């Protein structure tokens, strides 16, 4: 038999900045959003779901400097918490 499913579900997008705005990149150190995401992933994947981690990445950008940006979570259809359970 056939069953219905939602056409769009279980998505989460994480963008480097808000709409209209630039995102920064160092020529030897790499992009700040990318480096920050890795750092938070390495630290928090064990204890936090990806949505929580993404919020924490955002919080790390809260205090603006000369090169400011605010990473944005977009089009979220996660119905459950996504834990990475690293090591498992």
């Amino acid at each position: 038999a056939i069953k219905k499913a939602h056409i769009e579900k279980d998505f989460i997008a994480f963008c480097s900045s808000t709409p209209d705005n630039v995102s920064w990149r160092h020529p030897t150190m790499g992009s700040v959003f990318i480096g920050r995401l890795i750092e938070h992933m390495q630290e928090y994947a064990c204890s936090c779901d990806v949505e929580e981690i993404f919020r924490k990445v955002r919080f790390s950008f809260e205090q603006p400097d000369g090169r400011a940006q605010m990473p944005t979570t977009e089009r979220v259809t996660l119905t459950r918490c996504f834990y990475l359970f690293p090591g498992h």
Partner: protein
């Protein structure tokens, strides 16, 4: 030690895995057995461009993301310097990969120049636009066009500008 497959990623112990299984009920995404699962990830990074500035430092981002997603248990495809059409072709091929059937999730990473409308392909100019829209990424990976990933987390990471603005306003204390 960071010598293992997870590298610098802090491990979740079995006690931690039980506490998370307890603090939240059946509101966690199921993970497949480590012995059998075939997790896939795709990074598309544009550094060399025809008509716009070179994205110097992108290689550091490629290295970091590739190693990170591997640490988390994903097999990583790395594609470089593609046009919007090439990105679409690769995304379509990625959605068709049989491993997704024996996977519990996926990660998609896009690293390029971008504008308000979307992500810049290698051939982008103001005269001749070459843009992949975020909307199209979702369409190609949804239940219609990627049934293998039904009910499974699809995480999309984008490093890109979304316009010319600095993202700041002034205020006094």
């Amino acid at each position: 030690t960071s010598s293992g497959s997870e590298g610098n990623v802090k491990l979740c112990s079995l006690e931690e895995a039980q506490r998370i299984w307890k603090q939240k009920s059946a509101e966690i995404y199921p993970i497949m057995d480590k012995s059998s699962r075939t997790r896939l990830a795709l990074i598309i990074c544009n550094e060399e461009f025809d008509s716009i500035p070179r994205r110097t430092g992108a290689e550091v981002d490629i290295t970091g993301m590739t190693m990170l997603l591997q640490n988390l248990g994903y097999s990583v495809d790395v594609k470089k310097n593609l046009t919007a059409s090439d990105m679409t072709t690769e995304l379509e091929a990625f959605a068709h990969r049989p491993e997704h059937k024996t996977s519990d999730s996926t990660f998609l990473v896009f690293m390029s120049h971008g504008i308000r409308e979307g992500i810049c392909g290698k051939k982008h100019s103001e005269q001749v636009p070459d843009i992949l829209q975020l909307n199209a990424i979702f369409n190609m990976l949804n239940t219609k066009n990627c049934p293998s990933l039904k009910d499974k987390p699809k995480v999309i990471i984008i490093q890109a500008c979304r316009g010319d603005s600095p993202g700041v306003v002034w205020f006094k204390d």
